[PDB]
Amino acid sequence: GRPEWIWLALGTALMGLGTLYFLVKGMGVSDPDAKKFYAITTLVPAIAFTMYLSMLLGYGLTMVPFGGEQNPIYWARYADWLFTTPLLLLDLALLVDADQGTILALVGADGIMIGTGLVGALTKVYSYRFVWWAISTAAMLYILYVAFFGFTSKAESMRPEVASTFKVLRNVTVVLWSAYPVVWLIGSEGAGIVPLNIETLLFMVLDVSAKVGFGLILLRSRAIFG
Ligand SMILES: *C/C=C(C)/C=C/C=C(C)/C=C/C1=C(C)CCCC1(C)C
Ligand SMILES: CCCCCCCCCCCCCCCC
Ligand SMILES: CCCCCCCCCCCC
Ligand SMILES: CCCCCCCCCCCC
Ligand SMILES: CCCCCCCCCCCC
Ligand SMILES: CCCCCCCCCC
Ligand SMILES: CCCCCCCCCC
Ligand SMILES: CCCCCCCC
């Protein structure tokens, strides 16, 4: 009965219901282009649902000694993010017809971001936790830079309605993704200022917005149709 369980339960509900709704809508669509966006976007909260559910049931949690104490760390978050973050970037790349080499570079950077974040989260020497955090944050900023400058440039060649939908999704992505390193820094994995229950609340609001919110915006747009 960990106090953060309530937010894990609410995250589970929200991701579950989001997945179900996207699946129902997606299965009804016949346009092949729209179907690809549905397939990618439905998978995102589906993966998050399984990881939130696992954490709700007491899995994906480990104790890491640092700063003279035994600290609880939810590593299952990284398993979710390893797969869902590149899927979200793929949605954006597909909207703007980004180059294959750009997608490869972003997916590589994304793997670095999640992998070094996880190594950070598991590191037993307090100061070194922040070296890995800094490397992960640098990878994230490379991603946001490309999604902001590179993808907008590509969007300028698309019809205005596709460009408009892209810009809303780009803006949501920049605002939400840039919060994650700060929550990590001040929370359980970092400085230990924000207690685990509140941190779990914060990550739940961010996760639901970045996956279900993002998905609602994308999947209700005419932009996904070919
Ligand atoms: C659905 C989940 C989303 C959109 C998650 C995004 C998560 C990140 C951008 C995480 C970034 C991190 C850093 C920038 C450094 C510290 C650890 C990471 C994983 C939290
Ligand atoms: C023409 C070139 C150059 C370069 C580059 C710049 C630098 C740096 C950094 C950082 C960050 C971020 C992010 C973005 C976005 C919204
Ligand atoms: C006393 C010592 C040193 C430390 C640290 C810091 C460097 C912070 C640079 C952050 C780059 C992302
Ligand atoms: C005596 C100490 C030294 C240190 C520090 C630091 C500055 C490193 C800044 C790195 C920025 C990327
Ligand atoms: C598209 C060619 C540019 C490739 C740059 C790859 C980059 C970077 C990464 C990251 C991390 C710390
Ligand atoms: C893939 C990036 C690997 C960078 C290694 C840096 C070593 C950190 C010293 C604690
Ligand atoms: C001794 C702590 C400083 C380690 C610096 C690691 C450099 C990271 C390379 C990207
Ligand atoms: C806006 C948050 C500031 C409060 C941080 C905390 C603590 C003592």
Side-chain angles (χ1 to χ4, degrees):
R2 294 196 68 88
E4 68 270 18
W5 81 262
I6 178 72
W7 306 121
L8 298 172
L10 183 52
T12 298
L14 294 173
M15 295 296 188
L17 287 170
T19 304
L20 289 200
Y21 182 65
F22 293 168
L23 182 62
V24 169
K25 301 307 289 170
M27 289 293 288
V29 160
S30 46
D31 182 75
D33 282 1
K35 280 200 99 74
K36 306 298 163 287
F37 284 104
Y38 272 98
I40 294 157
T41 309
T42 298
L43 183 49
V44 167
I47 290 159
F49 170 79
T50 62
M51 292 307 168
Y52 265 89
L53 180 50
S54 290
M55 297 190 282
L56 179 57
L57 291 172
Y59 290 87
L61 180 63
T62 192
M63 301 301 294
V64 179
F66 59 91
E69 273 193 308
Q70 223 63 52
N71 305 113
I73 300 294
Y74 279 103
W75 60 267
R77 304 196 187 275
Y78 304 81
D80 168 347
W81 296 338
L82 180 66
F83 304 102
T84 56
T85 56
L87 285 173
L88 290 169
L89 298 173
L90 180 59
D91 266 342
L92 295 180
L94 291 179
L95 209 46
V96 307
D97 288 354
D99 295 346
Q100 192 183 181
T102 307
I103 294 167
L104 186 62
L106 282 173
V107 172
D110 198 291
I112 297 168
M113 180 184 77
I114 302 305
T116 55
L118 177 55
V119 169
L122 302 173
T123 287
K124 299 170 187 181
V125 175
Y126 208 164
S127 55
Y128 296 169
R129 294 180 68 81
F130 296 104
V131 173
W132 294 105
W133 172 87
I135 294 163
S136 176
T137 297
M140 192 205 67
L141 295 167
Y142 164 78
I143 291 165
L144 291 190
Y145 183 93
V146 165
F148 189 72
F149 286 102
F151 278 9
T152 305
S153 183
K154 286 281 177 175
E156 296 324 295
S157 294
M158 305 300 290
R159 69 195 160 88
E161 185 281 330
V162 175
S164 191
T165 294
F166 164 72
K167 287 178 197 173
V168 173
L169 295 168
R170 173 201 72 186
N171 285 2
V172 157
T173 295
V174 171
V175 172
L176 299 167
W177 285 43
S178 66
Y180 283 80
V182 180
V183 175
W184 197 103
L185 189 70
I186 72 185
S188 68
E189 300 88 359
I193 297 165
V194 175
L196 186 49
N197 68 313
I198 300 306
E199 173 165 38
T200 298
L201 175 53
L202 300 174
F203 281 137
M204 190 274 290
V205 168
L206 294 172
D207 282 347
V208 172
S209 309
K211 295 181 179 70
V212 181
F214 183 103
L216 288 163
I217 297 162
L218 173 61
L219 301 176
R220 74 183 223 83
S221 70
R222 22 295 132 92
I224 60 167
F225 288 83

